[PDB]
Amino acid sequence: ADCYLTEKKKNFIPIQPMMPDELPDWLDTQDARTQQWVKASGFVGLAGTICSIPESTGALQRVLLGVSDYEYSWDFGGLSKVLPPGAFQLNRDDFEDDEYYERALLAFGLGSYQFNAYRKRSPYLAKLFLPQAHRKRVTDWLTTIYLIRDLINTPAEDMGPSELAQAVKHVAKEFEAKVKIIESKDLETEFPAIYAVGRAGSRPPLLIDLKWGDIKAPKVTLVGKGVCFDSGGLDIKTPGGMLLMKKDMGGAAHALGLARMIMLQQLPVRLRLLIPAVENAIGSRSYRPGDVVQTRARKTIEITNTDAEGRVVLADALAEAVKEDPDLIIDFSTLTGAARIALGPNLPALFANQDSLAQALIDASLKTDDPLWRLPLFQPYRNYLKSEVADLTNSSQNRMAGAITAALFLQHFVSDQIPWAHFDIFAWNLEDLPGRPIGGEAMALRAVFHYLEQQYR
Amino acid sequence: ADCYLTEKKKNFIPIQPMMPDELPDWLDTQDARTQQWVKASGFVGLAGTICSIPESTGALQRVLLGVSDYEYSWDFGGLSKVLPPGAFQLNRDDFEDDEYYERALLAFGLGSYQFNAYRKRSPYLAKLFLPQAHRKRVTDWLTTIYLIRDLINTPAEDMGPSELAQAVKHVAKEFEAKVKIIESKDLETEFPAIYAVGRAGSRPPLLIDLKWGDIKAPKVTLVGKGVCFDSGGLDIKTPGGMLLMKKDMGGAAHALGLARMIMLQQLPVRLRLLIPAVENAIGSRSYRPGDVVQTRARKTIEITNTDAEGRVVLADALAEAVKEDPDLIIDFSTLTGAARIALGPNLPALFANQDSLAQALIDASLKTDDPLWRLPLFQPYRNYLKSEVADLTNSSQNRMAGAITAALFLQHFVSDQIPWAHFDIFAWNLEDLPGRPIGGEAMALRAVFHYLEQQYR
Amino acid sequence: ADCYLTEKKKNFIPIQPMMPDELPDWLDTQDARTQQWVKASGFVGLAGTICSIPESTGALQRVLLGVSDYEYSWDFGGLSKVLPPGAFQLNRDDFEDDEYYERALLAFGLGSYQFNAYRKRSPYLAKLFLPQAHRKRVTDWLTTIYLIRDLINTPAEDMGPSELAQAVKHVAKEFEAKVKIIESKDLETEFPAIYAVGRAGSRPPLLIDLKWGDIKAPKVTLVGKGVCFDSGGLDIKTPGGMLLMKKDMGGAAHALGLARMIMLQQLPVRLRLLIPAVENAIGSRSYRPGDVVQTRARKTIEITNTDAEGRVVLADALAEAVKEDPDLIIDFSTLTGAARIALGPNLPALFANQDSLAQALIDASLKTDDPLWRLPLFQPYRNYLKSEVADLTNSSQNRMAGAITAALFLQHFVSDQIPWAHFDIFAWNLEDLPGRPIGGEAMALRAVFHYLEQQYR
Amino acid sequence: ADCYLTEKKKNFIPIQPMMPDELPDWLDTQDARTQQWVKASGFVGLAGTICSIPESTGALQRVLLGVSDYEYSWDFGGLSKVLPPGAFQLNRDDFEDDEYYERALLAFGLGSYQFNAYRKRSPYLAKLFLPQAHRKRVTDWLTTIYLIRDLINTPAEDMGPSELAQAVKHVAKEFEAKVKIIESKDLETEFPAIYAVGRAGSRPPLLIDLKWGDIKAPKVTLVGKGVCFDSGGLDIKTPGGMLLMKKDMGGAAHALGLARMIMLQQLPVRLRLLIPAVENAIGSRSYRPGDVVQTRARKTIEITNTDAEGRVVLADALAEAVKEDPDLIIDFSTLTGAARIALGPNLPALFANQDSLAQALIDASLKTDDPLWRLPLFQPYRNYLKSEVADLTNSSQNRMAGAITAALFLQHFVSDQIPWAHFDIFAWNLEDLPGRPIGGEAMALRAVFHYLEQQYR
Ligand SMILES: [Cl-]
Ligand SMILES: [Cl-]
Ligand SMILES: [Cl-]
Ligand SMILES: [Cl-]
Ligand SMILES: [Li+]
Ligand SMILES: [Li+]
Ligand SMILES: [Li+]
Ligand SMILES: [Li+]
User: Class for domain D1-131, per CATH?
Assistant: First the structure.
């Protein structure tokens, strides 16, 4: 949180949003030198551009930031990369509501992110004042998003199942949450599907199970796909397909981040977090096409694609989650394969077995401007998962309906009587955009958290 | 054998074959109600269709089965899937000879097959009377074909080299045949080519060697390719190519099934069964392109395709078989690669080093309606197996003549003075056809067994 | 060296080079029978053809060899394959200079090469007299080239890191050079990049470090890529691409061969030879796309292609070489991928960080007729190696400039103040050409050695 | 040329290059306000960054431009995209020599380029003063480079053979050069290879032949590949491979641009420009693999790749050029296929049949900082062009040595006695770099022109 300043002072440099239509009238309120400079600079209010205005001394008086709209917020994410050095401040009066003011404060922080575990990088020299009224909420979100980005960005070699388990225990200690790690023989017996997928890796598979909160409160259970590296297994990926696969544990990072926000904000729920943590490797012990994998739910799965492993490990975590008849289950899973990204990289897919839940999450998406889109649990496609040998296959007969297929698979492990939402996310920025550096990224969480606050407070 | 009834009774429901041309005259011999019903039902004798005819009580009086011809037999294979519940019987008088009657009885049983090791399935409710005169032969064949289907259908995870060895020992116990298992260090020294192919798998390679019969009788030696799973090795298969690879031990299943029939029927031969049992895996210990593998025959093989492994392991089994100067050697091997299936999936390829043997097997094929087709050991193509480093390569320079190439490779290990037949089989039903459920399948065996009975009785 | 004779005699059969233009005048100097025979034979001096001329007894009098030019030399390489049996001799007077005479003597020997470790081969029956004045130089070169060919030709199974280390120790003993082998834990700590690449193989990685010569002499350090087998790693090669990969240690063979010539000829230098020896394997422990590998130079490398492993292991050897501030560093590395072979298979690429060195090597290439061609360390392409996570990536963003990219990568590990030459070589004959049998081959060494003799004597 | 100002005035805004090391001392010479502003802005001299400094009025006083070095020049190319509106000027005293001053002036203009034939674009608002002493040279180059960029950027539909011929005639009129267009039946008879390649297109093929200059002066003949669109023909390209193929006439654009500079600068030569202009299309009339194409040189070419068409059409233009025994022939051809771009996209390949010519062009490259690199006409690779049917094939047997192969093909049409240089160029900017907008680009020309001025003045 060193991109922010917390001691209030009367000498910070103001940053003011501006749109083209308001610039002429605003200039009329400024002195001669300011009017000449803004005109001489060529600044006209284009989104993402800035105009650094000098004092008569030559020091910086103010920075104008062109915005797409006064309620967009992400334009503020680009500030660290363009701002001159200094201590800056935003003005509450420049925003329609405290909510947009808080989003701008957070966007600034998100755009200041640099993953520096493997190379030295010069930190940005612009810092922003964070008012006490918004400090906890902005800090809680920034630190949680930074954690998600860090976990996804860490190379698989340094972020295997053990390291993921350690990260969960680190988060748990801050809130005295309890963590159980299911490994080796107990995993092999109790969670056979997690074991089958991860048994070929040099780093053994495990299940992370965290609990927190009042035992009398409604049970909210979060599940996240922790495939630390996905080679595809014997159905090996192409090089282009394998290049970003350190991110196939993005669902686990999201589930852990959401858990962290719930604990930071002390939501009145009984929280449980389940993360199957494995590597989908190629080697002498690899599970094979045609193999039948047993499950904790006592269903048999015929493996028709070793690279559709995420849903297989999630099936066991879900079977465990449902035993408690929780009030809500939410899972986060990363998408793999160019064709399965039906909604593109920046729009998480939502599946839900109950319409009220789906609609409430859609409403939350709009309120938070954290996009998501519902896809269907289209029942006729269950036929694509038909097996002549086992209860079902893990992948479909065709290259169509990939996303729906995975979600329908998981639905076999969750009763229609338990409210359940499944998120398919990309968890990565392919391009450098304001507030969104190339690499791991958090998505859907603000929407989900908003929903939880509305539902449980 | 629970699809059959063995206590003869006077109240079974008759099943009668019928062709369109005979239906009008047959109807003239029936009562009014029967004539009205057959006409009202729309049954006209189309192959595979049935007409269930009621008694005046509403119980079932008879079932007509449309047949392609009165000597085709496989139409009877579709009965379990369409018959109403009950105890049925065929009539010997409806067939030209006891041979067609027996084939119909067997086809019924073959179509009643359900592989249920991994899912619960409701058994068929129609059963057929099996007359005492045909009981042993039909049972012997049904149980042997079921065994072949079961072994092929079992996922590789549950059917590795050890499990295959156990299956052989189970069959051996019934006839007090002797079984030797060559493993680990002795295999590494004595059968280096079997070891090289299988050394990368987590389940180690072995050679199964079964013997039965009078030591004074003619030696018939059966050899079967037991590649429990074929990933292709470092020359990895495509996903479509690897999907059915649990079946790459189909040759071993066939050789074991043929051995079982020989023992059940007490053919007067000295039987030996040799099965190299391995997994062709990808891992740290995988044999590589360019590696030179030593053989039991003391020939060197340069590996030019790690996915042409079946012939490499068979070479050692054949080198062992020839040492005894047997009267006959027959090998069964499964085909891999869409392009190598020159005769399609339902027509086994036969290669033989002696013309009399090939012609006799062709004759047996026609007598049993168990199709096979001869392909040539075309000597000029030996040049395709030329190596600059070793005695020969294991695969050819081009993508043509795949089948011939494998057979010519094996011929280097078998003297022209020892009668030898090599069968390339697909061992799988891609589609659900009457009497032939999707999955593992037996082929060529009835023809081969007929030949053996004619030759050795 | 059994293709040569060392006891001088007056009854050897002369082999005489001939071009079409000189044949008519030469024939005029011969007897009637010789003139009739040469005309009757159809010999006209075409390059590579011969005319065996009889004595009146029917024994062989002389052999004419058609040559492309009197200074080409390689036509002599085809002699062992066409010569009748016997003891032959060349005539010094048939050559412009002793240099061409010596090249012809050597070419004869090079064309007599047969790799017979895995199959029996009949040796050639023609032998050539080697005069005492040229015996040491021709023998030194022939034995060194044979060694290079043998190491490259040996299948990877019989030429892993340990076997390569043993070969180096065998060469060292002859000259009492010292050899250190860096393995296991010390390698893991001190040469982490060599370890990361080779850790997945069943045969562990190591670094071979040989030293010889007067400690007061100029330091010449040779570095060679010893990838004993390259599967490509998780970014697995195609079968066609993996077929010749036993040759991916060709750079190590070249560096060892050059070291051997330096020691045989007692060049007044302080020689050091560094060979990273590893297998780039696929298995449970394989390094992955996205992994960040530490280096001896303390730079971080983001792995964007597991099949660009040679430069990664070389980086550690180079970082070690530079610590001594040597007078010269020369590395040899084999090319992988059809598209990276910009200069084709028979023209080694030279990169050098100092223009004088590059020009001197180019001059040496022309003097020795051992072809090489300079490619550029084009600095703007360093941008292709940009990483968002580490100091640099190991491979570029596109499929262009492959060779330049590898060389620029290595340049990050070598100061511009240390003269350094990097050779990208194919190290293999795809076709059987005179003096150049299919399989491993030595290239660039005569040019490099000539340069060293000119520079250090 | 509207990015430049030509009336000298005393009120232009100075643009001054600056490096980090000189900034502290420079600041010491400035007033208080300027020192405060430069420090407050965060400008430290990083290449490509600017610092707009205000006057006390708020108008712009000066712009500092960070440069990679004082002799690099391309940093000036980025100015139009970052400069505020205004009339600017450079200072001659800020450069080591008039040559670097002139390059900076030109780079500014090159970075102001916008291709607007198909969309409206706002022009840049910064203009630069162009001093009279450098006006002609800078204008001549800018207009010529703009022409090259425009021709390459024009979609193939609007830049077919006819449009290319029209562009040549437009350039010719300005200098009263003569132009002959060889079409239809005369082309079919006289230039059969140009006709064979282009006959399938809906826009017929032609040969453009321009002449200019004193008939007594040395003959310099320029040849350019005018493949207006390359589909690959029956050997059809992949979509990625065909996407930029409107640029396959880049060689023609280069040859025309070089011709234009020669005429603008009145070089004392007899200039001839030959451009085969065709579309390589797929349709009913497409030339085929295996077809033998006749040539103007009376050699036969067996077509082994319809997508190696550029060299086929160039062969006829070259055969025509050589008939006059010119003093020099220079051809420009665009590269096609990711693997053939051995030197990457930004480094043109030079081939030359005479060493003095190649060395002189290399020297010119260094003097002008217009990069090029020599590749070899490696004679042993002529064997790759062997045909069993015709005199030679148009493409090689392998996927290696692509560039060398094309150049060796062309060499069959040009005597070693005629000095000849062949340039393989990419002619496109894949990325937006300072002074180099995405799309068509000129390369190698400044080097070639420098050589011509040195050789012929
Ligand atoms: Cl990660
Ligand atoms: Cl099986
Ligand atoms: Cl080798
Ligand atoms: Cl164009
Ligand atoms: Li995955
Ligand atoms: Li196989
Ligand atoms: Li390699
Ligand atoms: Li082209």
Answer: alpha beta
Q: Name the 3-class secondary structure at D368.
A: helix
Virtual torsion, Cα D285, D288, D292, D294, nearest 10 deg: 40
How far is it, in rounded angstroms, from Cα B257 to Cα B148? 6
DSSP letters for A178-244: EEEEEEHHHHHHH-HHHHHHHTTSSS--EEEEEEES-TTSPEEEEEE-EEEEE--TTSPPPHHHHTT
- Parts of chain D belonging to CATH 3.40.220.10: 1-131
**Angle between the C445-456 and C355-368 helix axes, to the nearest 10 degrees?**
120
Query: Which residues lie closer than 8 Å to D99 by C-beta, 6 or more apart?
Result: none
Task: Point out which residues pair with B183 in neighbouring strands.
Answer: B206
The structure tokens listed for B339 are: 């392009």
Q: How far away is chain A from the Cα of C234, in angstroms, using its nearest Cα?
A: 7
B86 is written with which tokens? 């009950």
Q: B282 and A285 in contact by Cβ < 8 A?
A: no
Q: Among D22, D43, D46, which Cα is nearest to D34's?
A: D43
Q: Decide: helix, strand or coil at residue A415.
A: coil
Residues of A in contact with C399 (CB under 8 A): none
Task: Output DSSP code: residue A433.
Answer: B
CB–CB of D60 and A40 under 8 A? Answer: yes
Q: Which of C73, C343, C362 should one mutate to test binding to chain D, selecting the residue with the greatest count of D CBs within 10 A?
A: C343
Of the candidates B316, B308, B317, B144, the residue with the CA atom closest to the CA atom of residue B223: B317
- Of all ligands present, the nearest one to the C-alpha of B149 is 2
Partner residue facing A229 (CB), from C288, C300, C304: C288
For B304-437, strand residue ranges (E) read 328-334, 349-352, 373-374, 392-393, 420-425, 428-429
Which residues belong to CATH 3.40.630.10 in chain C?
132-456
DSSP D252-285: HHHHHHHHHHHHHTT-SSEEEEEEEEEEE--STT
Q: Which of D36, D57, D125 sits opposite A33 (nearest CB)?
A: D57
Residues of chain C in contact with residue A201, where contact means CB-CB under 8 angstroms, are 284
Distance between B313 CA and the closest CA of chain A, angstroms: 19
- Alpha-carbon distance of A139 to C241, in angstroms, equals 52
Listing DSSP states for D81-137 in one string gives HHPPSEEEE--GGGSSSHHHHHHHHHHHHHTT----SSS--PPPSEEEE--HHHHHH
In sequence order, what are the residues at sequence separation of 6 or more whose Cβ sits closer than 8 angstroms to the Cβ of residue B164?
B151, B208, B226, B228, B249, B252, B275, B277
Distance of alpha carbon A16 from alpha carbon A45, whole angstroms: 11
Side chain identity, residue B297? A
Instruction: Please list the active-site residues of B.
Output: 237, 311
- Which pair of structure tokens corresponds to residue B354? 């002696």
Q: Which residues of A touch C286 (CB under 8 A)?
A: 231, 281-283
Q: Give the CB-side neighbour count of residue D139, counting CA atoms within 13 A.
A: 15
What stretches of A42-160 show up as alpha helix (H) in DSSP?
79-82, 98-110, 132-153
Nearest CA in chain A to C389: A118
Closest Cα partner for C66 from C51, C45, C40, C42? C45
CATH topology classification for B132-456: Aminopeptidase (3.40.630)
The label of the residue with tokens 């199709």 reads B371
Tell how far CA C430 is from the center of its chain.
15
CA distance C223 to chain A (A): 28
Q: Which of B208, B185, B211 is nearest to B278 (CA)?
A: B208
Q: Which residues of A touch C236 (CB under 8 A)?
A: 236
> Does residue D285 carry a catalytic annotation?
no
Contact assessment for residue D427 and residue D250, using Cβ atoms and an 8 Å cutoff: yes
CA D343, CA A13: separation in Å to the nearest integer? 50
Helix, strand or coil, per DSSP, at residue B439: strand
